[PDB]
Amino acid sequence: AAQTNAPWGLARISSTSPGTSTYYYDESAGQGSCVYVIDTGIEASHPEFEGRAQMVKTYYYSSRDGNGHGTHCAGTVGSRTYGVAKKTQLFGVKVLDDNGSGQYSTIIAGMDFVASDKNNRNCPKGVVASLSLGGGYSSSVNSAAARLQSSGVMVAVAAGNNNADARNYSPASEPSVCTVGASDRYDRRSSFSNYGSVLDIFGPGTDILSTWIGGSTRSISGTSMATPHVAGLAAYLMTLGKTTAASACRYIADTANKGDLSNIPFGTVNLLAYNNYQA
């Protein structure tokens, strides 16, 4: 399949070279896989989700996304126009308030929810969890991410936006899960992207158009925007049978474009997510 005049990051993940604007992907499109988005919520009514997104859990007085951050990230995973895996199911876990803040105890509660809840859903091909959030180091946050991964979920995590070593952030610093850095349209590391040996993979993160609240769309930048590209790519690859939850981060790194990026510090991998599609 080919989606013409695609947002740049979708084009980037199906290309060996920068400078193209056509997303190429297998029509299976992540069907039968599921992705949880642990964030500020998802506007499930948005036209672009086509009835494939729902809110399953909140920890606040409402399950609606009043911020927008969660809906944008959900759109890069699974919206018809802006998403990687256009036919995936999208579950929303509201762990952050409408200001984008959340206590670590609530975040952990949402992670353990995913590990259990997945057993109550129909996701025969695969289960991913996108975690576009982070904060100060904590072994307990890292352990919850480890537990989720250990249950049979692929957990993608944003490295953080401090131009800093990601070892000091959580759950970015948990080795067993997939830690995602941000790149720009000219194959540079984004100038805000955390780096370091704990990073697994880079994905598009600067100027990423996706869905917002009110049925709208906008562009924003962050490692939070790279992470849903990788979460959607894993779902897509599990639907194709190429990899499993426990092996998808490694599969992605092995199949990635290698040595494309610039602004990579010594000690950080030079690996850009690639879907390997050959029409």
């Binding site: 911020n67 952050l96 959340g102 206590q103 959030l133 982070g134 904060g135 953080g160």
Partner: peptide, 6 residues
């Protein structure tokens, strides 16, 4: 402690 969107 408090986490935030990235």
């Amino acid at each position: 402690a408090a986490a935030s969107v990235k």
